[model samples]
Target: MKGTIVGTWIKTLRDLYGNDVVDESLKSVGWEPDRVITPLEDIDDDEVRRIFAKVSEKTGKNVNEIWREVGRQNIKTFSEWFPSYFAGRRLVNFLMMMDEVHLQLTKMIKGATPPRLIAKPVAKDAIEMEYVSKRKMYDYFLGLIEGSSKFFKEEISVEEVERGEKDGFSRLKVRIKFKNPVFEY
Candidate 1:
């Protein structure tokens, strides 16, 4: 199933029953409670639907209402994991920045060869990033480097290094160099 749909279901379960319910559900399905669900190669749809249904039954909430609440509460996880992305702002700011980056990056790589950014971190005066691409669009990754630099008003240097495929997974490793040392707690 799509990540957004599954994400909606996960969000719904968390909303109706709380973090314990959703965390336990994810554990029961052999997933870490804080695992990042990518758009590709994440959990299946039917399983997510089933999980949502169980939460709905337990919490006495309609699926639609559950989904709506889930969407509302979804960003908590993102903020927890990537607090720098949210900075000292709301979740909407983070989502808008990501949406803009996605649109601009997709437009720049219009030949059906867009790379997927998996993980990223923006610090007080620095940033780090990761990406995945089957076609090895190293240059395209630079667009994100430039975009992030422009958006955050910081200096960054991107390094494209190979992270070998493991069991049919294609992964690319990137290191973003920053001028200043930014500490995090």
Candidate 2:
């Protein structure tokens, strides 16, 4: 989810504040303003943190404030980019669902670090949710799945396909299979 959030933030900065502001901020951190992020590539958390910090420093804004604004703007941007997800539903409903997930997941984590979620509808009857944790948090991921199922009132079967630690991070991939086909958004 952090990647989605950061990706949205970068795009939002460019759209709302202008490319110049984002470009200059990225330049200050020795990063290209138009960096290409590959679908298979996973960006480091520190890099994301630094990017937000740079944005904060350049814009005289608090990081949390910027994140909150970015979070709000991301819904509009996401609906534009991925209309299928919002098909037949108001953007408010999608955003509210996400807010509930974020709130629930954070509450579960307490002070412990939360995993970043990368989710997408893979098929008419399935979705893929990847959880990236700093430390092994398999149980937490399971709890999240249960929470999501309960919150959405949808029955889902979750299967773990991958688990490992590398470069100081623990990554886990889970495939969620649903009873019926769900439209991609």
**TM-score, per-candidate, Cα-based:** 0.38, 0.48
Residue-level lDDT tens digits of model 1 in 1-185: 43533554465456557897777667655678765665444456456656666566666786655554554344454445445665743222332255355556457533323345654455554344555555443433444345445445655565666665655446666666566544443
1-185 per-residue lDDT for model 2 (tens digits): 23444465578768756788788766766778787554334456667667767777877887765665555455566556656555643222342254345556567544323456767767767767776766454653565455445444567777888888889888887787776556645
What is the alpha-carbon lDDT of model 2 when measured against the actual structure?
0.61
Q: Which 10 consecutive residues of model 1 have the lowest summed lDDT?
A: 88-97
**Cα-based RMSD of candidate 1:** 14.8
Each model's total of backbone clashes: 1, 4
Stretches of candidate 1 off by over 4 Å are 1-41, 88-95, 101-185
